[PDB]
Amino acid sequence: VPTFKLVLVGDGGTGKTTFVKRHLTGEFEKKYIATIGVEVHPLSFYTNFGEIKFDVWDTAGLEKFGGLRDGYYINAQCAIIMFDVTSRITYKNVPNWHRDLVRVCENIPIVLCGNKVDVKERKVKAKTITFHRKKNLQYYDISAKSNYNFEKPFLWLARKLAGNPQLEF
Amino acid sequence: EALVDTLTGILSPVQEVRAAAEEQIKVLEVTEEFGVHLAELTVDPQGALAIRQLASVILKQYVETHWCAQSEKFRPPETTERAKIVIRELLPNGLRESISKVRSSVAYAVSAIAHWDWPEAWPQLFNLLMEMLVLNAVHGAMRVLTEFTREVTDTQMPLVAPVILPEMYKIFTMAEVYGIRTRSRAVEIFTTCAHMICNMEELEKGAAKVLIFPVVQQFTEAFVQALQIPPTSDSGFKMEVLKAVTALVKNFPKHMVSSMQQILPIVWNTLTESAAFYVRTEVNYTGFENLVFSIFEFVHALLENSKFKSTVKKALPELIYYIILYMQITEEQIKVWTANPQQFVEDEDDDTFSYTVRIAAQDLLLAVATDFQNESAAALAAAATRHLQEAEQTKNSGTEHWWKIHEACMLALGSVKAIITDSVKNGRIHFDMHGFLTNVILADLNLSVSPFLLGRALWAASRFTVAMSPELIQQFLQATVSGLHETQPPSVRISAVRAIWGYCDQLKVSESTHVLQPFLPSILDGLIHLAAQFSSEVLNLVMETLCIVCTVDPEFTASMESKICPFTIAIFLKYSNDPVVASLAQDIFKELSQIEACQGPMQMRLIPTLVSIMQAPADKIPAGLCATAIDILTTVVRNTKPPLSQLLICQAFPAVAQCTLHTDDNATMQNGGECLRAYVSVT
């Protein structure tokens, strides 16, 4: 019944569509097909007390395929910055993604995540990352194939959305 | 009119209408009347604010795309001067009396415009008027200034900094009209400009030159005038000022040398007063966290500059006391940890991602210890003794919150065990280690004040094993093993598991494991029974402790392998996805495979499940599982005796062969690659 719009802003080819599909219905797809623009994959979730809708508004990473960056963030209720633990460039512009994200929507709970815990965790970026420290940014590490914390970001967002830290699927 | 319906489509989820509206945007933009429409839609009140933000952000795109034929992102329909002079006087009419969203969006747009038109110099003083006109109006100009000064390149910076920075100091010093928040944002603007200008001076000099460098002195004195003030009591404002002072210290130390001897005492007073306030208002509770983190970052930076290094060492024994004063567990954290043991295992871990005052203080302590090992050890000894004395004093009076100082003292003394225990080895201090363990650690194992103290005491006895009597060792181990039981709360159980890790490491390195020998079966039984209660994060620790326990003594494992092997295999199956679970399983099997007495049963119990995993379809078993199975097989075969078993050659070899043959997953082929490569190691 309640609809909660969130947003992915993962730079580069770091997994976002694989993530959303694997959560929507299916399994991991190896083939790289960069999304041009935004495709909402409605994703509802049942809870121990209630039911939550998370219309993931996946967005494009690369420049040329942007279309409308900052265009679809309006009327958001959360967001999931992203970057892969295997790439180095996907981190050094997380501050830029954050400034572009928190500007249009004010201080919505954002969970800086990390994909593919399987390959090499904290490989080229740094063995530790100091961006989530002071702000309202809950870090994590998930996987779209291994399916590791693959309910934890959405659990965190639901908890911080309804308020009760007791919600569970 | 119809100009706005498209934007509603841009906000809509349905793919078709969104694509249609996006193409409408891409096609109508070429008309010069676009920007004026965007402005008249975003500035006009009485409208869906979402549409306002949409128009403003699309206007940002416009200014980036059809304003400068020289920009790397130019589009054919360049903007006519008429629409330019129209919006340029119609756009700034926002920034006023609205929700911060649309104001910040209009500010984004203005900064985009102003990013181009500062050299051509249209009137850039309308916002300057809003500085003195009262509130919502000023917040708009402040956001404009922030965005602009973040946008200016290295070229404009030596020109715009000597213009903004004087007016910035004007705004800051004037504390009568400009509220706290506006002054804080002015400070942030100064810090941004200084950081970027020092970056430029690093790239191409010109910053510390005849330019703003004196204004740096002006602002330094302005800062050192601010911290004393309790109005303007906003703690976050003090946080911004302190962050700015850290910027000054780290960027150009040479200018800070003269006045820093005056800045240090007020920082010290802030630290002490904030320690008292925190202990009162958050620890014993029936943006300040950001302030504390700022003070700690300042101390960190102060430790960096070589000339400023000896400045902290002189007052080190007076700092570690307040550090330890900060490491107390807060009531909110006690509630959370009691309500969610997963969070207790994630946070108190020593490679965490959470960041609470406790963790920051712990980092500060580890740093100032690893930098001044001898001095820091002596200072930690003295301050721990002083804390012990004050704790005993307030204990005689029976204070309801006396133990939290014991927890923090134990944590500080353990988390740096190396330097302190080494200094005690040569007696460079006069801290009674035996007295510490007896009267402090062991004596508190018998109380009934709170579980977390019991657990911290268990975890603390772990570090100082190299200095304790054998009877003390037996006492501590007997208490710890009793800690894995179900009668105790989960937190003390988890801490006891960590203590068992510490024992199995230290005693083994100490080559004295025959003291742990009579405790193994109880230890392993408790570990096993724990792992079957809690699911993920507790397991991620239990399995590692189990690996170390196996490493303790091979004979015991050879006796009780019939327990380790089935549990480890069942867990590696049910919880195969996790990476650290897989690595821990592989480590168990590796350490287990050294025991030649375990060969038979381990192979007989594992190889069937391994091959059955290999045979299964790639789309039926959970993903990544085949890879971990292959790696486990590699470890088994490589880390075993040269003569191979009949089970491997008859099943493992053809199974992995056909697996590598018919597979297509890159990871599968890769890991199987080393598998077959390791198989060639046959003699």
Ligand SMILES: Nc1nc2c(ncn2[C@@H]2O[C@H](COP(=O)(O)OP(=O)(O)OP(=O)(O)O)[C@@H](O)[C@H]2O)c(=O)[nH]1
């Ligand atoms: N091998 C492996 N790849 C993964 C895993 N999880 C995510 N991926 C990645 O998922 C990606 C699929 O691309 P998308 O999901 O569309 O993300 P993207 O490449 O940024 O594409 P856009 O959304 O258009 O930006 C692949 O490139 C994989 O690298 C994993 O667990 N294992």
